[PDB]
């Protein structure tokens, strides 16, 4: 019980690592969405400077 | 025949003494056997629980 269930607790430990890493995975994906938006914004500002009167 | 009736009864007493002493010897033997068998049972129990543990893992 101590030890076969100690392995069961390691699996619980395993669940802790899986849930904690899953949380980081989705947070990283959300941060990529922000980064991609900023990169798109830069391209849109590139489109603006391609103008003449608006850029002046 | 008085002496003989007495001797015959003494022989019966002797046998009685033997019968209970032998019973006590058997008791001691049975107790040691009980301990060895117990351990053998423990080993079987152990094998079964080992199997359950591995199954569970």
Curated annotation (Swiss-Prot), chain A:
The keyword Membrane is assigned to this record: yes
One GO cellular component, as annotated: extrinsic component of synaptic vesicle membrane
GO molecular function: ATPase binding; proton-transporting ATPase activity, rotational mechanism
Location in the cell: Apical cell membrane; Cytoplasmic vesicle, Secretory vesicle, Synaptic vesicle membrane; Cytoplasmic vesicle, Clathrin-coated vesicle membrane
Organism for this UniProt entry: Rattus norvegicus (Rat)
Gene Ontology biological process terms from the UniProt entry: proton transmembrane transport; synaptic vesicle lumen acidification
Primary location: membrane
Phosphoprotein among keywords: yes
Expression sites by tissue: Expressed in brain (at protein level).
Keywords, ordered alphabetically: Acetylation, Cell membrane, Cytoplasmic vesicle, Hydrogen ion transport, Ion transport, Membrane, Phosphoprotein, Synapse, Transport
Function summary: Subunit of the V1 complex of vacuolar(H+)-ATPase (V-ATPase), a multisubunit enzyme composed of a peripheral complex (V1) that hydrolyzes ATP and a membrane integral complex (V0) that translocates protons. V-ATPase is responsible for acidifying and maintaining the pH of intracellular compartments and in some cell types, is targeted to the plasma membrane, where it is responsible for acidifying the extracellular environment.
Residues of the full protein shown: 58 to 113 of 226
Protein name: V-type proton ATPase subunit E 1
Protein family per UniProt: Belongs to the V-ATPase E subunit family.
Subunit structure and binding partners: V-ATPase is a heteromultimeric enzyme made up of two complexes: the ATP-hydrolytic V1 complex and the proton translocation V0 complex. The V1 complex consists of three catalytic AB heterodimers that form a heterohexamer, three peripheral stalks each consisting of EG heterodimers, one central rotor including subunits D and F, and the regulatory subunits C and H. The proton translocation complex V0 consists of the proton transport subunit a, a ring of proteolipid subunits c9c'', rotary subunit d, subunits e and f, and the accessory subunits ATP6AP1/Ac45 and ATP6AP2/PRR.
Domain of life according to the entry: Eukaryota
TM annotation in the entry: none
